[PDB]
Write an enzyme that holds these catalytic residues in place. Structure first.
Site, PDB file in Angstrom:
ATOM      1  N   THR A  97      -5.058   6.500   2.078  1.00 47.92           N
ATOM      2  CA  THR A  97      -5.423   8.029   2.054  1.00 47.92           C
ATOM      3  C   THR A  97      -6.027   8.627   1.049  1.00 47.92           C
ATOM      4  O   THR A  97      -5.740   9.701   0.511  1.00 47.92           O
ATOM      5  CB  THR A  97      -4.045   8.820   2.132  1.00 47.92           C
ATOM      6  OG1 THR A  97      -3.064   8.076   2.686  1.00 47.92           O
ATOM      7  CG2 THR A  97      -4.558   9.627   3.574  1.00 47.92           C
ATOM      8  N   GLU A 109       0.942  -1.063  -0.075  1.00 46.47           N
ATOM      9  CA  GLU A 109       0.036   0.052  -0.058  1.00 46.47           C
ATOM     10  C   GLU A 109       0.691   1.207   0.111  1.00 46.47           C
ATOM     11  O   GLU A 109       1.383   1.517   0.992  1.00 46.47           O
ATOM     12  CB  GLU A 109      -0.897  -0.222   1.161  1.00 46.47           C
ATOM     13  CG  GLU A 109      -1.694   1.192   0.956  1.00 46.47           C
ATOM     14  CD  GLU A 109      -2.633   1.580   2.273  1.00 46.47           C
ATOM     15  OE1 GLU A 109      -3.412   0.487   2.750  1.00 46.47           O
ATOM     16  OE2 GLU A 109      -2.593   2.576   2.867  1.00 46.47           O
ATOM     17  N   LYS A 122     -11.649  -1.507   6.171  1.00 47.28           N
ATOM     18  CA  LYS A 122     -10.245  -1.035   7.081  1.00 47.28           C
ATOM     19  C   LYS A 122     -10.811  -0.767   8.516  1.00 47.28           C
ATOM     20  O   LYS A 122     -12.028  -0.497   8.927  1.00 47.28           O
ATOM     21  CB  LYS A 122      -9.720   0.116   6.354  1.00 47.28           C
ATOM     22  CG  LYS A 122      -8.397   0.699   7.451  1.00 47.28           C
ATOM     23  CD  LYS A 122      -7.817   1.532   6.238  1.00 47.28           C
ATOM     24  CE  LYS A 122      -7.032   2.792   7.081  1.00 47.28           C
ATOM     25  NZ  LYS A 122      -5.779   2.845   6.634  1.00 47.28           N
ATOM     26  N   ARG A 167       0.012  10.371   0.849  1.00 45.64           N
ATOM     27  CA  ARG A 167       0.166  11.497   1.798  1.00 45.64           C
ATOM     28  C   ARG A 167       1.163  12.565   0.920  1.00 45.64           C
ATOM     29  O   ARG A 167       1.569  13.480   1.473  1.00 45.64           O
ATOM     30  CB  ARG A 167       0.639  11.343   3.145  1.00 45.64           C
ATOM     31  CG  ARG A 167      -0.066  10.186   3.765  1.00 45.64           C
ATOM     32  CD  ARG A 167       0.116  10.467   5.035  1.00 45.64           C
ATOM     33  NE  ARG A 167      -0.521   9.187   5.738  1.00 45.64           N
ATOM     34  CZ  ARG A 167       0.049   8.212   6.493  1.00 45.64           C
ATOM     35  NH1 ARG A 167       1.626   8.121   6.427  1.00 45.64           N
ATOM     36  NH2 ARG A 167      -0.552   7.037   6.978  1.00 45.64           N
TER      37      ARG A 167
END
Lengths: 200, 200, 200
Positions: free
Chosen positions: B66, B40, B126, B44
């Site tokens: 994100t 992953e 998640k 960011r």
């Protein structure tokens, strides 16, 4: 005049997952002998339904737990359930419950969730999962800012947690399945014990 | 047939924040050598994109983390991402994901959040931030009442937490960045170790 | 140019529940003597209103806490309040606040709640109840994935928690009532102490 009056009076709400050999009527009697006249049959098994049917005349205030849709909610009520419980808030289940004029205790956790429930006219709320989320300390913060809500904490609560819960002023009852493991003299003991650890 | 099959098979999902000097292809190889074929890349930093591009041929099941808007979601997919992840549930990102037919693992925490996700047809969620929120104990309560949900816990999980997570039955994989600090022989070790602490 | 500049500068936000004998002007002075020019009067009592009125000229940035409806929000503002706070997010209170052009710090907890607030243009959020929910560790996870949000943690925070909060980069101020128990030399001490435990 309170439809959850029995619940308020036990302070205690066992939950039961039916595996299908239980002595339901036996259990019923012990519960009511011990000052505890409500019980929650989870619908995690189709036998949960058969058990509501079986306990219909028992004199128990019967709750249906894990109710996750309006249809499952209807089915529970036709099985003998007097109140509905679900792990999170389902607006459609609340519409079924208000339609049939029966109590619905949606599970909540966050202040925002609390407002949302309140906005549906629900002021008796499940707090779940209580233990991982620090039930006692959380319900203490809600006592001040939600002075109008009563809570039914459930989820991983053990005996030793009880005296802490008993001091809170916004407590409807404490739920759990831990109460119900063992044999009829076993269960009785646990009930009598949790009953005593609450209000000392 | 599962699109998250690789993920289910690692049980383990490292997260990577690109600072821009990393040996991506190196990392890729070590990961796949070690039984762990998903990774992953957090968005960011704009370099997170360049890193998805760079790892496109790597043979890794690549996730984008994100992802906080449908556009950022589209961009990730055009960069080589095969699945999307965001810290909380974004309905508009789920609409982009269903449009493009790719998996979306919204972050959730509360039972209510779980239902809401479920209602969008999402059953791989998640759980974030896992450690502050008591991931293991929470996912244990959800195993019973959400028997249909698999979870990807992430957020402050350390090595020593693993054997507890490994006993849960509703676990898709455990996420973290802790796996990826160090040097190639360093990271390998941590991966090999977390891989072993899960399923013993 | 920041309307919460005073708040950012204290790093500290006492909360006050009025029981009606307090020396408000006294308190005001001590607060402003000590580097702390904001204060939050909870509306859990009608006297909270009278106290905003009484402190109008004090030179304090006054907040109104437990604001649970647009009307209660309006009333607070006409009492002298410069910013509004509620335990959970109320969209209708945010509409009143944007209408009147004043800051509104809805309480949040979950990543999803954070997005929802963000979606209303709110990037200064209450984190409540902070202590039961592991404020420090949670706000540390949000520092990375919500780099644009500042937080006001409140709820069961004690003195000893401060140095942990002070290291976070996404901290607007820490709220509490603990600061305000005692007598004027008492309170002063606690304020001076919490002020120092933050930024060392």
């Amino acid at each position: 005049m309170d439809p959850l009056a029995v619940l308020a009076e036990s302070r205690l709400l066992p939950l039961l997952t039916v595996r299908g050999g239980e002595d339901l009527l036996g259990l019923a009697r012990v519960l009511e002998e011990e000052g505890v006249g409500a019980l929650e049959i989870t619908l995690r098994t189709e036998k949960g339904l058969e058990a509501l049917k079986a306990l219909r005349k028992s004199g128990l205030l019967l709750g249906a737990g894990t109710v996750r849709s309006p249809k499952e909610a209807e089915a529970a009520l036709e099985a003998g359930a007097a109140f509905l419980v679900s792990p999170g808030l389902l607006e459609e289940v609340a519409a079924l419950a208000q339609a049939r004029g029966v109590p619905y205790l949606p599970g909540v956790l966050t202040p925002t969730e609390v407002e949302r429930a309140l906005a549906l006219g629900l002021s008796a709320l499940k707090f779940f999962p209580a233990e991982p989320f620090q039930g006692v300390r959380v319900l203490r913060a809600y006592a001040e800012v939600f002075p109008e809500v009563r809570f039914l904490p459930t989820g991983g609560i053990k005996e030793e947690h009880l005296p802490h819960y008993a001091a809170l002023p916004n407590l409807l009852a404490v739920g759990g399945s831990w109460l119900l493991q063992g044999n009829l003299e076993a269960v009785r003991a646990k009930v009598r014990a949790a009953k005593a650890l609450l209000s000392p």
